[PDB]
Write a protein that binds this ligand. Structure first.
Ligand code: CXT
Ligand code: BNG
Length: 265
């Protein structure tokens, strides 16, 4: 019971620390949708630009907007973890001695299973986190997001982009473990691997988040592939990678921060 709460706090620290660079990343990633929704007046020039305008127009507190969602995200996930993660690992898991391909495939399957299982209960918090991040306001808080989204689109409005998120989880896990196996030291390895994996899986996250953004709007995408097609055709392939640099920055920040807090505890 105590260890649970301590874990909660422990990740709350990391998420809260990484919050300012996260919102900038989310802003750059989702700016076209905000432009469609008349929430943003002009496209951002880049990271520095977004930081500047957001600071001068919203303030300093704004960089932590939506972060409470990230904080309270810990508690429902871990309850599902403790209850199902071991059992799920038991069904697919392998030692590499039993065969590398079996180990890898079982790892993808297990990560995907546990992942989808968590998201089935937790996705809406991610949705709210995103919607609150992307603003300049349209929503007032978590409860407002839930109430309004349910009012317009209902439950499905809260879970939009679920499938590319699951696909994203599997892809990311595969790249992560693959690179981690193919390869001051720990920080290096972790950073490089997480970077490669997050970058290669980044378009799925863009599709996911923008689909989230379409909630509460008359115009929506007709599937993840449809979103992909439209974004590419109108804005270019690079549009799928908007905010990726900021996301990497978020990674390098987060790793150091969580290491420091672990050292402090
Ligand atoms: C399409 C995408 C992109 C790629 C996949 C995901 C994650 C990276 C996917 C990542 O997925 C994490 O991957 C880790 C490495 O495999 C894995 O750790 S491990 O099993 O011990 O090895 C985590 O599992 S857990 O049991 O420890 O908790 C797993 O998180 C989850 O499965 C919980 C879900 C609620 C997400 C979690 C997460 C993270 O940045 O870390 C997070 O939710 O914070 C995602 C961000 C959103 C995207 C980005 C999703 O939009
Ligand atoms: C304790 C006894 C040893 C059991 C595990 C042995 C180490 C497993 C390493 O396997 C190899 O890993 C490579 C990754 O670099 C794969 O690319 C390659 O396909 C695979 O053959």
């Amino acid at each position: 019971l105590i260890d649970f709460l301590m874990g909660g706090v422990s990740a709350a620290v990391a998420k809260t620390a990484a919050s300012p660079i996260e919102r900038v990343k989310l802003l750059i990633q989702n700016q076209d949708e905000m432009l469609k929704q008349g929430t943003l007046d002009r496209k951002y020039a880049g990271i520095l630009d977004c930081f500047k305008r957001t600071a001068t127009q919203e303030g300093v507190i704004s960089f932590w907007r939506g972060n409470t969602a990230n904080v309270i995200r810990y508690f429902p996930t871990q309850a599902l973890n403790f209850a199902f993660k071991d059992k799920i690992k038991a069904m697919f898991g392998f030692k590499k001695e039993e065969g590398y391909a079996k180990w890898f495939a079982g790892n993808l399957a297990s990560g995907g299973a546990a992942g989808a299982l968590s998201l089935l209960f937790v996705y809406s918090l991610d949705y709210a986190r995103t919607r609150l991040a992307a603003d300049s306001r349209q929503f007032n808080g978590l409860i407002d997001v839930y109430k309004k989204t349910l009012k317009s689109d209902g439950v499905a409005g809260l879970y939009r982009g679920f499938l590319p998120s699951v696909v994203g989880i599997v892809v990311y896990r595969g790249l992560y473990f693959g690179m981690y196996d193919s390869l001051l030291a720990s920080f290096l390895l972790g950073w490089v691997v997480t970077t490669g994996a997050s970058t290669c899986s980044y378009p799925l996250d863009t599709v996911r988040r923008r689909m989230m953004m379409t909630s509460g709007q008359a115009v929506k995408y007709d599937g993840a592939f449809d979103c992909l097609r439209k974004i590419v055709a109108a804005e270019g392939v690079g549009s799928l990678f908007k905010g990726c640099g900021a996301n990497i920055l978020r990674g390098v920040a987060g790793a150091g921060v969580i290491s420091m807090y672990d050292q402090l505890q």
